[PDB]
Ligand binder design. Structure first.
Ligand SMILES: CC(=O)N[C@H]1[C@@H](OP(=O)(O)OP(=O)(O)OC[C@H]2O[C@@H](n3ccc(=O)[nH]c3=O)[C@H](O)[C@@H]2O)O[C@H](CO)[C@@H](O)[C@@H]1O[C@H](C)C(=O)N[C@@H](C)C(=O)N[C@H](CCC(=O)O)C(=O)O
Ligand SMILES: Nc1ncnc2c1ncn2[C@@H]1O[C@H](COP(=O)(O)OP(=O)(O)O)[C@@H](O)[C@H]1O
Ligand SMILES: [Mg+2]
Ligand SMILES: [Mg+2]
Length: 502
C-alpha cells in the first residue's frame, strides 16, 4: 500500500534540502513555507491530495504535460526540471520547484516525506544478471522459517508478510518504493528482501534506501538496449557494493563463480564471498547430489569451516550458488543455516525451474529463461549424457527482434528436441517470429514448429521417455498469450498434459 499515517514535511524544507528553486519567483517562497507534503508520486494519475507531483522527462513523454491532471487530483506542488517549466509555461495553481536532475534526488525526497522507512527496516538488496528472483525467495523462506516477518519486492510481485500484491516493475520508482517501505513499517515488517535491477540503480529508483546487505549473484550480457555498454551495466550494479558509493550496503555478499563476480568482490573490498564452483570463498558448497523429486542436496561450508547438510527443491548447479548467497545473506542478518534449512528444503520459487510432477516418469520443468544468455545456462545445467532434453519456447512480438535467431541456435545445440511456439506474438504475424528462431536451428537436435502453445507442451510431454527432461521456457511465472490477451499458464498447461498421459 501507501502508508496510512504520514506526518508531512513543510514544502520549504523539501525545497531547501534538494536545493530546488521556485518557477514563479523567489518570493513565492512565503506560501511554500506553508504547504505540507504528505506523499510523492511521479505518475499524475496516482496523486493523492497533499502529494508532491514529480514531473520528470522520459523516453516517451514529459510528466510536465500532466500537471493539470495532478493538480486536479489535489497535488500541492510540482517538482520538475527546466525542460519541465517550459512545458508548464505560465499558470499552475500550485508551487513549482525546479531542479536539474530531479529523478536523481526524488529518492531522498520520497524517503524524507515517508519518514525514512529503511532506517527502521533491515533491507536486503539483491542484484545481478540472473538469480535475483530465486535468491530473494530463498532468503524470504529462510527468514520465515526462522520466524521473522518479511516483505519481498521483485519480478513476481510484492509480499507484505502474507499479503501478495503484484508489481509493475522489478524495482519500483523511488516514491513507490519508499511508500511501500513505509507501509511495511506500519504493518510490523522487520526485514525486507528486494530484487535490485540495474535499471533501478541507473534511474536512481533506490535512492533514499539504506541497505543492511547487498548481494551480487552474477553478470552476463543483458539489458544492452538500455545500458549503452556492458561497462555501464556493471557500473550500475557496482554502485551497491563500492565502499565509497552512496548506495553501499552495510554488508556485501558476492558470488565468485562468474568472472564479473570476482570483479565485484574486489570492488566491495570486504565482500563475503561465495562459491559453488570449487573456488575459494567464505561460503563453499560440495557433495552436490541430484535427489528423487528433482531436488539437490549438498554441504554448505560456512566462513568458519563448518559443514551444513542443505537440501534445495530446485535443479541446476547455479541454484546451489543462489542458495549459498541466500545462506550467507541469512547468516549476516543473524539467521543460522540450522534455522533456515527447513524453509529452504521446501521452497519452490514460481516460474524458476519449477518442476511439475503430477504423475511420474521424467522431469517436467517451467522456466522463465527468455534471453539467449538465460537459455544457454539453463539448458547446460540440465544436460546430462544418457538423458534426453526437450525444450519448448517462443519469442515475444514487438520485443527485441535480434534475440530470436540466436536462441534457436543455442537451443539446437543443447537440446535433443526443440519445439518452437508462440510467446506473446503481439501485433506481429507469429510465423515470422517462429521462422526466425528456426533460422537459428539451421546433428544432435531435432526441431519442430508447433504454433499453438498448449499443443507444443503436449507434443513434448508425449515425446519424453522415463528419465528425460522437458523444459517449458520463456514464460516462467508470466501468464496470458498476447496476440486480445488470451489466458495461458505454463504450469497449468504442463500439469494438464501430464495428466493426459494416462
Ligand atoms: C526504461 C525505463 O526505465 N522506463 C520507465 C520510465 O519511463 P520513462 O520516464 O519514459 O516514462 P515516460 O512515459 O516517457 O514519462 C516520464 C514520466 O512521465 C509520467 N507520466 C506519463 C504519462 C502519464 O499519463 N502520467 C505521468 O505522470 C510518468 O510518471 C513517467 O514516469 O518511467 C516509468 C515510471 O517512472 C516507467 O513506466 C518506465 O518503465 C517501463 C514500464 C519499463 O518497461 N521498464 C522496464 C524496461 C524496467 O524498468 N525493467 C526492470 C527489470 C529487468 C529484469 O527484471 O531483468 C525493472 O526494474 O522493471
Ligand atoms: N545463479 C544463476 N545463474 C544462471 N542462471 C540462473 C541463476 N539463478 C537462476 N537462473 C535462471 O535464470 C532465469 C532467471 O533467474 P531468476 O531466479 O528469475 O533471477 P533474476 O530476477 O535475476 O532474473 C531463470 O530461468 C533461472 O532458472
Ligand atoms: Mg535483468
Ligand atoms: Mg527477477
Amino acid at each position: 500500500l501507501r502508508p496510512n499515517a504520514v506526518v508531512g514535511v513543510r514544502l520549504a524544507a523539501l525545497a531547501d534540502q534538494v536545493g530546488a528553486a521556485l518557477a514563479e519567483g523567489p518570493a513565492q517562497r512565503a506560501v511554500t513555507e506553508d504547504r505540507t507534503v504528505t506523499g510523492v508520486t511521479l505518475r499524475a494519475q496516482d496523486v493523492s491530495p497533499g502529494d508532491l507531483f514529480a514531473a520528470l522527462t522520459g523516453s516517451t513523454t514529459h510528466g510536465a504535460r500532466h500537471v493539470g491532471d495532478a493538480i486536479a487530483r489535489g497535488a500541492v506542488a510540482v517538482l520538475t526540471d527546466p525542460a519541465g517549466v517550459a512545458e508548464i509555461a505560465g499558470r499552475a495553481a500550485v508551487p513549482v520547484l525546479v531542479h536539474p536532475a530531479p529523478r536523481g534526488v526524488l529518492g531522498g525526497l520520497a524517503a524524507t516525506v515517508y519518514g525514512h522507512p529503511s532506517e527502521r527496516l533491515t533491507v536486503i538488496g539483491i542484484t545481478g544478471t540472473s538469480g535475483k528472483t530465486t535468491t530473494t525467495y530463498l532468503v524470504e523462506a529462510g527468514l520465515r522459517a526462522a520466524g521473522r516477518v518479511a516483505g519481498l519486492i521483485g519480478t513476481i510481485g510484492i509480499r507484505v508478510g502474507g499479503a501478495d500484491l503484484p508489481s509493475a516493475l522489478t524495482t519500483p520508482e523511488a516514491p513507490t518504493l519508499q511508500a511501500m517501505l513505509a507501509a511495511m513499517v506500519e504493518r510490523g515488517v522487520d526485514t525486507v528482501v528486494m530484487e535490485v535491477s540495474s535499471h533501478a540503480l541507473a534511474l536512481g529508483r533506490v535512492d533514499g534506501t539504506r541497505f543492511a546487505v547487498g548481494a551480487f549473484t552474477n553478470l552476463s550480457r543483458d539489458h544492452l538496449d538500455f545500458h549503452p555498454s556492458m561497462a555501464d551495466y556493471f557500473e550500475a550494479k557496482a554502485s551497491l557494493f563500492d565502499p565509497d558509493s552512496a548506495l553501499r550496503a552495510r554488508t556485501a555478499v558476492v558470488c565468485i563463480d562468474d568472472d564479473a563476480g570476482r570483479a565485484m568482490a574486489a570492488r566491495a573490498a570486504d565482500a563475503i564471498t561465495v562459491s559453488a564452483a570449487d573456488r575459494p570463498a567464505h561460503w563453499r558448497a560440495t557433495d552436490v547430489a541430484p535427489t528423487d523429486a528433482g531436488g539437490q542436496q549438498f554441504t554448505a561450508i560456512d566462513p568458519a569451516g563448518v559443514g551444513h547438510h542443505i537440501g534445495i527443491r530446485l535443479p541446476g548447479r547455479y541454484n546451489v550458488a543462489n542458495c549459498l548467497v541466500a545462506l550467507a545473506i541469512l547468516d549476516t542478518v543473524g539467521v543460522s543455516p540450522e534455522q533456515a534449512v527447513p524453509g529452504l528444503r521446501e521452497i519452490r520459487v514460481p516460474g524458476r525451474l519449477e518442476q511439475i510432477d503430477r504423475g511420474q516418469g521424467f522431469l517436467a520443468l517451467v522456466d522463465y529463461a527468455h534471453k539467449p544468455e538465460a537459455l544457454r545456462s539453463v539448458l547446460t545445467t540440465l544436460a546430462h549424457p544418457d538423458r534426453r532434453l526437450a525444450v519448448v519456447f517462443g519469442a515475444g512480438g514487438d520485443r527485441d527482434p535480434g534475440k530470436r535467431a540466436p536462441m534457436g541456435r543455442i537451443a539446437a545445440q543443447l537440446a535433443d528436441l526443440v519445439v518452437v511456439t508462440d510467446d506473446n506474438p503481439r501485433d506481429e504475424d507469429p510465423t515470422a517470429i517462429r521462422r526466425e528462431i528456426l533460422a537459428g536451428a539451421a546433428g544432435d537436435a531435432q526441431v519442430v514448429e508447433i504454433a499453438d502453445r498448449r499443443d507444443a507442451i503436449r507434443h513434448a510431454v508425449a515425446w519424453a521417455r522415463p528419465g528425460d527432461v522437458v523444459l517449458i521456457a520463456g514464460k516462467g511465472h508470466e501468464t496470458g498469450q498476447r496476440g486480445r490477451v488470451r489466458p495461458f499458464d505454463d504450469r497449468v498447461e504442463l500439469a494438464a498434459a501430464l495428466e493426459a498421459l494416462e
